[PDB]
Design goal:
This is part of a larger assembly, with chains A (32 residues) and B (50 residues). With 32 residues, chain A is mostly loops. Helices cover 0% and strands 0% of the residues of chain A. Chain A contains no helices and no strands. Classes of the chains: A little secondary structure (32), B little secondary structure (50). The complex binds 2-acetamido-2-deoxy-beta-D-glucopyranose (NAG). Chain B: Belongs to the complement C6/C7/C8/C9 family.
Chain lengths: 32, 50
Amino acid sequence: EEQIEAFKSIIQEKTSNFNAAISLKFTPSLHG
Amino acid sequence: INDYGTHYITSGSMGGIYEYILVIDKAKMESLGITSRDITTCFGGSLGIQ
Ligand SMILES: *[C@@H]1O[C@H](CO)[C@@H](O)[C@H](O)[C@H]1NC(C)=O
């Protein structure tokens, strides 16, 4: 009698996030 | 010699013979191997200047 078994499992994940919060406000009539 | 043999009978027993033999051989070999490895890397950076 002969018997053999083989199991394999692989999982891959890669997150990514990139904020950008930049504001401009200027007032010395003139306004910005 | 070939016609009359190399030896002759001087004595013995004329009875029956019963020889029983029960040879049994059994072998079993098992080998199991499991290997699992997991890795995780997580890194982030925030830089703000105003
Ligand atoms: C934005 O900033 C927050 C807090 O620092 C962070 O958790 C997030 O991963 C960033 N990126 C996004 C929301 O896409």
